[PDB]
Design a protein around this ligand. Structure first.
Ligand code: PLP
Ligand code: PLP
Ligand code: CL
Ligand code: CL
Ligand code: CL
Ligand code: CL
Ligand code: MG
Ligand code: MG
Ligand code: MG
Ligand code: MG
Lengths: 360, 356
């Protein structure tokens, strides 16, 4: 039929082969004559999937053997409270770097549970940049330092990660995990809802330094202890089996295209197509982020006034573009260009942008 | 290539629901995207989300003063979320123990507050549901918690107690929407979807609105989810889509009364087989408490038990091993398990007994 270009911000485009693979075996997985959704998570067919998803992640991000990979329910949002529940102990401080709205939501949950601090923030200038690491106010009693690697709503992204030795570095990488190579040992824990760059909603990937958190925390509900899930290999209670399966399929696809290094090359190219369009528009389109902080995953911009914003977004939607409206809290536009968004979608968006500009 | 899916959780689903999912997996509702590729704030997703709630409301006849929530974390997270929200200081989380899942729920409440056992059949290894006249209730109960179907032990509430001093709360994971319900008896009902309603990944919570909060994490307040219509954060969109599909199948076959007829025939096939076996097969549950959802039984000794389960597996039956905590055999016959599978089981049971 007509064209559809999927710029949804979360859940988002999946790579076609992962969906085609799921479709073909939806009723009969691994010759069992059952859907993967109808299997016991204690079945060997399921355990294979569960283990493969872990091994693919391990290989793709080169995760060290002293880290474990958890598959949890509850979204990144549940991790906002689970993290301080496990690590924010009395006399310690949950230290946060604020670089957007998702950083503020993380902070707020820690405030419910303990002492917090703000190491650095670009909130005053509306989160157009990542603060300089030299500006980080660190405390000797910090339980951890928490960052948001990619600020989904504001379109900014860490180019690199701070060296932190006094506390574990924790990162919400929901919207850029496995979009590029990562030195995992810079961190004590990384978490990501899968629905932005790794597959479906319903599972949250948590990569954790085992010794930071494989120990029981007194007074914490069993389901809310990392230790519980580490010990049981994310099989303490029933896992989201279809979500983990789809995650596996998506990871297989990333591996098939050459891994993190190859997908970074693709992601830089798609992003360049859109930012060059903005940058050659003589101010018709204005990116929110400062150039040194531009996200490769979420491209945020405005036209010169809200009327043009609305006409542009209405024209997009009529031409088959999905998800370009900015987050409700900030307005404007947001082109989400996660791993699986195809480059011709990006070219199509550029075409749209240029004709709208020329005809305005 | 004959397979009979008696898995206990996750479990068989209706073929029409899975076929419908397969057909539109790449192109949902002519959007040219998977349901999995939609924003949860899209109208496209929002209609599915609402349709799943609407179907549950219709099928269980849920009154207007109840809200239907779709949460992550399984029934296991509800074990702690419930007392987190309702077990206020100077109140008591009161539990009726009818199996190991009851025990797991009570354990989480003990972390957070005062608990109590209203009644328990544990001493007799959970062969029955206690008499309601036996319950020990307290003026300051925050709630009375029960497990409607005791998945590991194969017993089930025939009816529910009339409780007015505190909200009645029920873990219905393994029998929700297997029969009509009087939802007004309860302040809250919860269930992982993965037994009777859908795939794993979503938990259905039916809650009396005005029943349910300083200092509880945002994600763990029922009020968060009630206020946001279970769209506070990203829901498990595909699981809710599949739940809708399963609910459409139940509606299409005639609703809660119709599925109860099927379920009672399924259970009748197995229990009759056991009762007519002259002691070769022995059911764990007392007759009066027999579950329609999980049929638990053993052969006369461990070696015959093992021989039977081996023969079963060879013949294409899946999931019949009993829970590791109790051994024996367990035939889970949730909504989507077809009558033909239970007939096959019967015939295998009869042949095995003849050939022993
Ligand atoms: C989407 C998003 C979240 C929210 O994830 P949920 O799974 O909806 O809780 C949190 N952090 C970031 C950076 C996000 O982009
Ligand atoms: C399966 C089951 C549970 C566990 O559900 P999860 O989704 O695995 O947490 C809890 N209670 C009962 C009665 C069950 O049958
Ligand atoms: Cl943000
Ligand atoms: Cl977002
Ligand atoms: Cl039980
Ligand atoms: Cl069980
Ligand atoms: Mg491959
Ligand atoms: Mg193309
Ligand atoms: Mg219909
Ligand atoms: Mg008879």
């Amino acid at each position: 039929v007509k064209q559809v270009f999927n710029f949804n911000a979360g859940p988002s485009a999946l790579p076609k082969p992962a969906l085609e693979r799921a479709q073909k075996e939806l009723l009969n997985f691994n010759d069992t004559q059952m859907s993967v959704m109808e299997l016991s998570h204690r079945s060997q067919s399921y355990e294979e999937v569960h283990e493969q998803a872990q091994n693919l992640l391990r290989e793709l991000l080169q995760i060290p053997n002293d880290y474990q990979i958890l598959f949890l329910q509850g979204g990144a949002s549940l991790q906002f409270t689970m993290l301080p529940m496990n690590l924010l102990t009395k006399g310690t401080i949950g230290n946060y770097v604020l670089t957007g709205s998702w950083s503020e939501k993380a902070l707020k949950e820690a405030k419910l549970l303990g002492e917090t601090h703000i190491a650095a923030s670009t909130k005053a200038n509306s989160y157009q940049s990542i603060p300089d690491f030299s500006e980080f106010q660190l405390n000797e009693n910090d339980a951890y330092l928490h960052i948001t690697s990619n600020n989904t709503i504001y379109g900014t992204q860490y180019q690199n990660f701070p060296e932190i030795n006094h506390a574990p570095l924790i990162a919400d990488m929901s919207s850029d995990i496995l979009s590029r190579p990562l030195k995992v040992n810079q961190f004590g824990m990384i978490y990501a809802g899968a629905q932005k760059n790794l597959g479906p909603s319903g599972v949250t990937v948590v990569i954790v330094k085992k010794d930071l958190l494989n120990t029981k925390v007194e007074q914490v509900p069993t389901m809310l202890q990392y230790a519980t899930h580490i010990k049981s290999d994310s099989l303490y209670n029933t896992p989201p089996t279809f979500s983990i399966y789809m995650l596996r399929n998506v990871l297989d696809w990333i591996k098939d295209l050459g891994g993190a290094e190859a997908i970074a090359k693709q992601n830089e190219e798609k992003a360049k197509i859109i930012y060059d369009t903005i940058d050659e528009s003589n101010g018709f389109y204005v990116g929110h982020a400062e150039k040194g902080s531009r996200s490769l995953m979420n491209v945020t911009f405005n036209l010169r006034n809200e009327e043009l914003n609305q006409q542009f977004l209405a024209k997009a939607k009529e031409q088959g573009f999905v998800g370009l409206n900015g987050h409700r809290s900030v307005g404007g536009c947001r082109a989400s260009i996660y791993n699986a968004v195809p480059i011709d979608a990006c070219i199509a968006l550029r075409e749209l942008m240029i004709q709208f500009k020329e005809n305005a």
